[PDB]
Amino acid sequence: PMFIVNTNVPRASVPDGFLSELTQQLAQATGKPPQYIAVHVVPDQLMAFGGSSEPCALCSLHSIGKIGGAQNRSYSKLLCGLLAERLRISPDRVYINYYDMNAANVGWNNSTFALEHH
Amino acid sequence: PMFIVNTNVPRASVPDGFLSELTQQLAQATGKPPQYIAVHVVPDQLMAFGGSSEPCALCSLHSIGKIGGAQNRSYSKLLCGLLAERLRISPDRVYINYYDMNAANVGWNNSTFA
Amino acid sequence: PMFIVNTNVPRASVPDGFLSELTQQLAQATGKPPQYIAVHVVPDQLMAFGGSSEPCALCSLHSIGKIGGAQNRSYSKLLCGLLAERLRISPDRVYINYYDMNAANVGWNNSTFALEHH
Numbered sequence A, C: 001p002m003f004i005v006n007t008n009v010p011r012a013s014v015p016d017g018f019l020s021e022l023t024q025q026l027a028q029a030t031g032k033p034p035q036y037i038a039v040h041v042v043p044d045q046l047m048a049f050g051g052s053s054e055p056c057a058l059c060s061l062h063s064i065g066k067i068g069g070a071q072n073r074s075y076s077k078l079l080c081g082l083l084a085e086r087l088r089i090s091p092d093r094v095y096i097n098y099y100d101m102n103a104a105n106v107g108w109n110n111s112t113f114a115l116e117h118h
Numbered sequence B: 001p002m003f004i005v006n007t008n009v010p011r012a013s014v015p016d017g018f019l020s021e022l023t024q025q026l027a028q029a030t031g032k033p034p035q036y037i038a039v040h041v042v043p044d045q046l047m048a049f050g051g052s053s054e055p056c057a058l059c060s061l062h063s064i065g066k067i068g069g070a071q072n073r074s075y076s077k078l079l080c081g082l083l084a085e086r087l088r089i090s091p092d093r094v095y096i097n098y099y100d101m102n103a104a105n106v107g108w109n110n111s112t113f114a
């Protein structure tokens, strides 16, 4: 899985261990091994949510499967929780785009995750 | 709705009021309330369009519904117009990816829109 | 087509000619004219792959058509090869999300690539 967070919160406000915490928590939530989880945090961004520049975050979570109604609600509770406690961003100022990726559309290690057909 | 603009134009060339103009015009164009519109502008990027480093922009607009043939042509005229007037980027050096999001695939406020 | 590379490798490590090499090689691989290929390289990013901060890259390739099983494996071999040779990133620390875009969902030049029906 791949999780990206873009926020106007300053870099100094990102706590040590944050990328590791996201990796570990996402591994647990998705059931995927941590070795396969990638995380990218982008602070100091020029952005607004509802016309306001108060702290906010625009994010995305891509995963091959493990994406759906109930799971996404659960992912959001988890992620909004972490953004609120770690970056002090209010949950109602957080957007998370979820993408259910097809294995053939995810490249890795010189190939893709579609290794069964030619 | 969520709108992102990545450009090689320098930050100093982004005019005061740009994020607000984007927010209000997108609210108008999509019919969505402005308090739910999010905008992200990323200047000073290392990018090329057609192999050239002249000003350009790579964007995306995500919306739950309100995405389609005519509407997207409408959004593109509006957005290219703004990028041309405000950031001096030629419309033919602008790409905008449109995404019609399913409500269950958009997280917000500890839950999703489903 | 549009190709984005986000990486924790420093800017200084991006070699002169990289954006042009990506443009030319992607034109070749997708069969699309180079004039329509857009590339964006984002170095010095705060990111982790598998919990580690060793060099890695999270990428995306968007194209109207020319996206599929065999083609994506070919794009991955090409792109991981370039990232390994030019940015010294291990192919197993690279993820590339492929997006087959519908022409009506790609804006350009005040309109979209859907010019047939209105």
Ligand SMILES: CCOC(=O)c1cc2ccc(O)cc2oc1=O
Residues within 6 Å of the ligand: A001, A002, A032, A036, A062, A063, A064, A065, A101, A106, A113, C095, C096, C097
């Ligand atoms: C085999 C499927 O499981 C995995 O490890 C995955 C890797 C992965 C990489 C990139 C990505 O954008 C989305 C992803 O989702 C996954 O489930």
Ligand SMILES: CCOC(=O)c1cc2ccc(O)cc2oc1=O
Residues within 6 Å of the ligand: A095, A096, A097, B001, B002, B032, B033, B036, B062, B063, B064, B065, B101, B106
């Ligand atoms: C007002 C109802 O719809 C909304 O609020 C929306 C929010 C939203 C968030 C994130 C996103 O990627 C795309 C979105 O599109 C919308 O229509």
Ligand SMILES: CCOC(=O)c1cc2ccc(O)cc2oc1=O
Residues within 6 Å of the ligand: B095, B096, B097, C001, C002, C032, C033, C036, C062, C063, C064, C065, C101, C106, C113
């Ligand atoms: C005319 C030949 O093809 C094109 O123009 C294309 C442009 C394009 C723009 C943005 C994008 O995200 C993906 C794209 O894929 C294409 O094939």
